[PDB]
């Protein structure tokens, strides 16, 4: 099978199964990792040696 | 006589090794046989000064 | 500017309980009458510092 | 610091 | 030119 | 006049140095006595 | 080159 | 073109501001400082390997051990014939001052001082003795007992 | 007694 | 007079890149045989 | 007069870390053979 | 130079 | 004693 | 070097 | 602090 | 930094 | 060409 | 041209 | 000691 | 006499190999047979100056 | 110099 | 009795 | 605190 | 930058 081009597609029955299990797992929408700037200031703040 | 050379030295004690294989450790004031009594331990120069005027150094072949 | 702890960029762990205020460890002081009490009002003569 | 180092 | 003790002594001017 | 007043400020100054050294001594002396009241229990190990 | 180094080491061993 | 020249000289003064002379003299300042740092004031205690006779008769005084901060003193126990005397058990008074470890079968206890000279005392129940061996530990003395061979008054399981 | 690294010509 | 310090800034932004480009050391690989 | 107390400040911001590294005494480690 | 008593006694000026 | 990288003609 | 040290140590012994 | 250390 | 490199 | 190269070479070789 | 002593030594003008 | 790329005729 | 060439040199010690294959390590002050007493270590020029005026360099087939 | 009870008694001036 | 660490010459 | 300690 | 290249 050659399904739709330029996208997550299944070439075979097994790949259809794999696509669906990704799909119900909601793996296509990963959780939001933090920012550069925000997490970054909080980082250099947290791991800095205090009182110096 | 028996000639000793420094085996190691730090501020205070200095460990020295003679030609007979004997190893000793010394302080500011100690009796060294033949050498008399040690006046000073110059650890950063690896130098021992004793009352008999002679000076204990690291051996030529180990310094 | 040197009298203010917040401007002491040095991370000083010294006596934090004796500072006059959060903005000055040592007070500048107030006018004092010639006798030696607080010159709150100009009407009484203010001569010294305290 | 001595000069005979 | 500086020795290990931290005290600095230098030559003045020498060319080869 | 000015000399008189800064001499008086210096005279008033020489009373609080003792109390600040006293406070520093509270910080030191309590820490020593707390070190000193500490007793640590003896430990026993039974052989194999 | 080496002249400066030699003058320097002499000046170092002369001044303790 | 000389703008290139003075700009380059200025940057070689900024990115590598530590001159090759300056890197080395900072080096030397480093080892002088941390050598005077690491240098133990006074003479260090002399490292000695000694041997004491342990008398357990009433009125006898407990044998002494000279120790030091962070150095290992190895106490090996021998009977009158000098043969090893394994340990039944031990009891350290104030192990907040002293850390002894001991492989559980041998006849050696190895002891490090943890605070500099405060002294303490130790009980060591040996194999065949109803009488425990009591030893006074003093750190920071003018000698350090790298080892001591203490000859207990009795006879052990090794004769 | 002498700390020679506390030394100066 | 602004030319010299603007020059120092741009050449230094380059030079930091070059020194980083030399500080790299790419570790060798070992490939076994069959 | 102020250079003095800044001096002393930097003295103590060195001396406190010296004293803290001197209370550090690390316990011996043991390795028993096979 | 400082001793182990804490009182700082120093030499004045000596060269070799 | 000499760090000759700290050298200069 | 050594002369400064020996003068120092003799001064320390002299002034206890 | 004595001098006969 | 010498001229006999 | 190489004249500049060897001239700079001898100039560096002569100045330490 | 620049040397490996770190000091720049150049020729003046040479062609070929 | 001569870097030919640093050449100028 | 016996010819040595520098097999390695850094600030301070210099490791020297001879025509007999013998290996040595030297410092500022070190007795070297034949050449005498080492005067200076020139690690960037690969050079060793000794008291006899002889200059010790990297081997010509090794430099 | 200080005793164990709390009272402080101190020698005036001596040298060795 | 004498606490000689608090010594004064 | 006595002197006969 | 040479001319005999």
Report CB contact under 8 Å: U2, V7: no
Whether the CB-CB separation of H102 and H124 falls below 8 Å is answered with no
Whether the CB-CB separation of H154 and H148 falls below 8 Å is answered with no
Dihedral sign computed on CA atoms, order T15, T18, T23, T25? negative
Which position has the token pair 């260090």?
A: H44
Question: For residues H136 and H122, what is the distance between their CA atoms, to the nearest angstrom?
Answer: 6
Residue F12's Cβ-side half-sphere holds a number of Cα atoms within 13 Å equal to 9
L15: chain G residues, CB-CB within 8 Å: 15-16
J14 three-class SS: helix
Question: For residues A44 and A38, what is the distance between their CA atoms, to the nearest angstrom?
Answer: 10
Rounded to a whole number, what is the largest CA-CA distance in chain F? 88
Question: For residues A18 and A27, what is the distance between their CA atoms, to the nearest angstrom?
Answer: 11
CB burial class (10 A; 0-12, 13-18, 19+) of residue J24? Answer: exposed
Neighbouring C-beta atoms of residue H56, cutoff 10 Å: 14
Neighbouring C-beta atoms of residue H151, cutoff 10 Å: 18
D2: chain N residues, CB-CB within 8 Å: 1-2
Q: Among residues L14, V5, H29, H28, which one has the least CA distance to residue L1?
A: L14
Question: For residues H62 and H55, what is the distance between their CA atoms, to the nearest angstrom?
Answer: 8
* Residue P2 φ then ψ, to 5°: -125, 160
What is the residue-wise DSSP string for K2-25? HHHHHHHHHHHHHHHHHHHHHH--
CB burial class (10 A; 0-12, 13-18, 19+) of residue A27? Answer: exposed
Q: Among residues T5, S1, T48, Q4, which one has the least CA distance to residue P1?
A: S1
Whether the CB-CB separation of B37 and B29 falls below 8 Å is answered with yes
Assess U16–O contact: CB distance below 8 Å, yes or no.
yes
Report CB contact under 8 Å: I4, B28: no
* Residue A43 φ then ψ, to 5°: -60, -65
Whether the CB-CB separation of H56 and H152 falls below 8 Å is answered with yes
Whether the CB-CB separation of H99 and H110 falls below 8 Å is answered with no
Whether the CB-CB separation of C18 and C24 falls below 8 Å is answered with no
Q: Among residues B5, B13, B8, which one has the least CA distance to residue B54?
A: B5
Q: Among residues J13, S8, J22, which one has the least CA distance to residue H7?
A: J13
Which position has the token pair 């040290």?
A: N5
- For chain D, the C-alpha Rg in angstroms (whole number) is 4
**Contacting subunits of N (3+ beta carbon pairs below 8 A):** B, D, I, L, O, U
Question: For residues H150 and C7, what is the distance between their CA atoms, to the nearest angstrom?
Answer: 64
- Contacts of G9 by beta carbon, 8 Å cutoff, 6+ apart: M1, M2, T40
- Contacts of H52 by beta carbon, 8 Å cutoff, 6+ apart: H63, H64, H148, H149, H150, H151
Question: For residues W5 and Q13, what is the distance between their CA atoms, to the nearest angstrom?
Answer: 85
Does an H or E element contain B40, and which?
strand B36-42
F30 three-class SS: helix
Assess X2–S contact: CB distance below 8 Å, yes or no.
yes
- For chain O, the C-alpha Rg in angstroms (whole number) is 4
> Residue A40 has what DSSP assignment?
H
Question: For residues H155 and H123, what is the distance between their CA atoms, to the nearest angstrom?
Answer: 19
Whether the CB-CB separation of T40 and P4 falls below 8 Å is answered with no
Q: Among residues B27, B45, H25, which one has the least CA distance to residue L16?
A: B45
How far is residue R3 CA from its own chain's centroid?
7
Which position has the token pair 């005392």?
A: H121
- For chain P, the C-alpha Rg in angstroms (whole number) is 4
CB burial class (10 A; 0-12, 13-18, 19+) of residue H99? Answer: middle
* Residue C46 φ then ψ, to 5°: -110, 125
Question: For residues B26 and H139, what is the distance between their CA atoms, to the nearest angstrom?
Answer: 20
CB burial class (10 A; 0-12, 13-18, 19+) of residue B40? Answer: middle
> What burial letters (b/e) apply to C19-34, b meaning 16+ CB within 10 Å?
beeeeebeeeeebbee
Assess R5–P contact: CB distance below 8 Å, yes or no.
yes
**How many CB pairs (< 8 A) connect H and I?**
9
Task: Please state, in angstroms and as integers, the Cα–Cα distance from residue T3 to each residue in T20, T36, T59, following that order.
Answer: 8, 13, 10
Q: Which two tokens stand for residue A27?
A: 């793996």
Question: For residues H144 and I3, what is the distance between their CA atoms, to the nearest angstrom?
Answer: 21
Question: For residues H35 and H137, what is the distance between their CA atoms, to the nearest angstrom?
Answer: 30
Dihedral sign computed on CA atoms, order F28, F29, F34, F37? positive
Question: For residues B24 and B19, what is the distance between their CA atoms, to the nearest angstrom?
Answer: 12
K2: chain C residues, CB-CB within 8 Å: 2
Neighbouring C-beta atoms of residue N8, cutoff 10 Å: 24
CB burial class (10 A; 0-12, 13-18, 19+) of residue R2? Answer: middle
Residue V5's Cβ-side half-sphere holds a number of Cα atoms within 13 Å equal to 1
> What burial letters (b/e) apply to X1-5, b meaning 16+ CB within 10 Å?
eeeee
Question: For residues T32 and T22, what is the distance between their CA atoms, to the nearest angstrom?
Answer: 12
Whether the CB-CB separation of H135 and H52 falls below 8 Å is answered with no
Whether the CB-CB separation of B30 and B14 falls below 8 Å is answered with no
B50: chain N residues, CB-CB within 8 Å: none
Task: Please state, in angstroms and as integers, the Cα–Cα distance from residue K32 to each residue in A43, H103, J17, K8, T20, following that order.
Answer: 42, 8, 51, 49, 46
- Contacts of H115 by beta carbon, 8 Å cutoff, 6+ apart: H69, H96, H97, H139, K25
How far does the CA of residue G16 sit from the closest CA of chain Q (Å)?
28
Residue F26's Cβ-side half-sphere holds a number of Cα atoms within 13 Å equal to 7
Residue B40's Cβ-side half-sphere holds a number of Cα atoms within 13 Å equal to 22
Question: For residues H144 and H73, what is the distance between their CA atoms, to the nearest angstrom?
Answer: 8
CB burial class (10 A; 0-12, 13-18, 19+) of residue P4? Answer: middle
Size of chain T, expressed as the number of residues it contains: 63
Neighbouring C-beta atoms of residue B13, cutoff 10 Å: 20
Q: Are strands F43-46 and H87-92 parallel, antiparallel or unpaired?
A: antiparallel
- Contacts of Q6 by beta carbon, 8 Å cutoff, 6+ apart: none
**How many CB pairs (< 8 A) connect R and X?**
3
Question: For residues J13 and K13, what is the distance between their CA atoms, to the nearest angstrom?
Answer: 35
Q: Which two tokens stand for residue A2?
A: 């050659």
Whether the CB-CB separation of H52 and H136 falls below 8 Å is answered with no
E-state strands within chain V: none
> Residue A52 has what DSSP assignment?
-
Question: For residues T8 and T15, what is the distance between their CA atoms, to the nearest angstrom?
Answer: 5
How far is residue H100 CA from its own chain's centroid?
11
A26 three-class SS: coil
Rounded to a whole number, what is the largest CA-CA distance in chain Q? 25
Question: For residues H148 and H130, what is the distance between their CA atoms, to the nearest angstrom?
Answer: 23
Beta bridge partners of B5: B17
Task: Please state, in angstroms and as integers, the Cα–Cα distance from residue T17 to each residue in L5, T5, T10, T20, following that order.
Answer: 52, 5, 15, 8
* Residue H81 φ then ψ, to 5°: -80, 0
Q: Among residues H98, H158, H106, which one has the least CA distance to residue H128?
A: H158
Question: For residues T5 and T35, what is the distance between their CA atoms, to the nearest angstrom?
Answer: 12
> Residue B53 has what DSSP assignment?
S
Rounded to a whole number, what is the largest CA-CA distance in chain R? 28
Assess N13–L contact: CB distance below 8 Å, yes or no.
no
Cα angle, residue T55 at apex, residues T52 and T61 outer, rounded to 5°: 140
Task: Please state, in angstroms and as integers, the Cα–Cα distance from residue F12 to each residue in C28, C29, C47, H65, H67, following that order.
Answer: 15, 13, 17, 57, 53
- Measured in Å, how far apart are chain T's first and last C-alpha atoms? 22
Q: Minimal Cα distance from G1: which residue of P?
A: P2
**Contacting subunits of V (3+ beta carbon pairs below 8 A):** O, U
Question: For residues D5 and B42, what is the distance between their CA atoms, to the nearest angstrom?
Answer: 10
Q: Are strands F43-46 and C46-49 parallel, antiparallel or unpaired?
A: unpaired
Q: Among residues H134, H110, H112, which one has the least CA distance to residue H122?
A: H134
Neighbouring C-beta atoms of residue L6, cutoff 10 Å: 9
CB burial class (10 A; 0-12, 13-18, 19+) of residue T43? Answer: middle
**Contacting subunits of K (3+ beta carbon pairs below 8 A):** C, H
What is the residue-wise DSSP string for E1-16? -B-TTS-B--------
Cα angle, residue H41 at apex, residues H27 and H110 outer, rounded to 5°: 105
E-state strands within chain C: 31-33, 46-49
M3 three-class SS: coil
A28 three-class SS: coil
Question: For residues N11 and N5, what is the distance between their CA atoms, to the nearest angstrom?
Answer: 10
Question: For residues T11 and E4, what is the distance between their CA atoms, to the nearest angstrom?
Answer: 12
Neighbouring C-beta atoms of residue H67, cutoff 10 Å: 26
* I abuts D (3+ Cβ pairs < 8 Å): yes
Whether the CB-CB separation of K31 and C28 falls below 8 Å is answered with no
Whether the CB-CB separation of N3 and L15 falls below 8 Å is answered with yes
Q: Among residues H151, H147, H155, H159, which one has the least CA distance to residue H127?
A: H155
Which position has the token pair 């870097």?
A: S3
């Amino acid at each position: 099978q050659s399904g739709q081009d330029s996208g997550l597609t299944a070439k075979s029955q097994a790949q259809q199964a794999l696509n669906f299990i990704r799909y119900a797992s909601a793996q296509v929408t990963p959780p939001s990792l933090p920012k550069l700037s925000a997490y970054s200031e909080l980082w250099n703040q947290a791991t800095a040696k205090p009182n110096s | 006589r028996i000639i000793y050379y420094i085996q190691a030295v730090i501020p205070g004690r200095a460990w020295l090794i003679g030609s007979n294989g004997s190893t000793l450790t010394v302080r500011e004031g100690s009796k060294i046989p033949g050498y008399g009594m040690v006046k000073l331990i110059d650890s950063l120069q690896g130098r021992i000064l004793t009352s008999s005027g002679q000076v204990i150094k690291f051996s030529q072949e180990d310094s | 500017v040197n009298n203010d702890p917040a401007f002491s960029t040095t991370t000083s762990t010294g006596n934090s309980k004796n500072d006059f205020s959060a903005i000055a460890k040592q007070q500048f002081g107030v006018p004092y009458k010639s006798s030696g009490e607080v010159c709150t009002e100009y009407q009484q003569v203010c001569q010294t510092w305290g | 610091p001595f000069g005979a180092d | 030119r500086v020795s290990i003790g931290g005290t600095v002594y230098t030559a003045k001017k020498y060319d080869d | 006049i000015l000399q008189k007043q800064n001499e008086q400020l210096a005279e008033q100054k020489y009373q609080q140095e003792i109390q600040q050294r006293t406070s520093d001594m509270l910080t030191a002396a309590t820490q020593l006595v707390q070190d000193w009241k500490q007793v640590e229990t003896q430990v026993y190990t039974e052989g194999t | 080159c080496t002249d400066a180094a030699l003058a320097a080491l002499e000046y170092h061993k002369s001044n303790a | 073109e000389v703008i290139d020249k003075k700009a380059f000289k200025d940057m070689t003064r900024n990115l590598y501001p530590l001159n090759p002379e300056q890197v080395v003299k900072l080096k030397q300042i480093y080892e002088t400082s941390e050598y005077a740092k690491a240098a133990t004031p006074g003479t260090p205690p002399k490292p000695t390997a000694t041997s004491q006779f342990v008398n357990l008769s009433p009125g006898s005084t407990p044998p002494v051990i000279r120790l030091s901060q962070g150095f290992v003193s190895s106490l090996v126990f021998l009977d009158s014939t000098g043969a090893p005397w394994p340990i039944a058990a031990y009891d350290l008074g104030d192990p907040s001052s002293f850390n002894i470890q001991w492989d559980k079968t041998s006849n050696t206890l190895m002891i490090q001082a943890t605070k500099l000279y405060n002294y303490g005392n130790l009980a060591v129940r040996l194999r065949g003795l109803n009488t425990p061996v009591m030893l006074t530990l003093i750190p920071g003395q003018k000698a350090v007992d790298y080892r001591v061979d203490l000859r207990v008054q009795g006879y052990g399981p090794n004769a | 007694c002498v700390s020679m690294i506390g030394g100066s010509r």
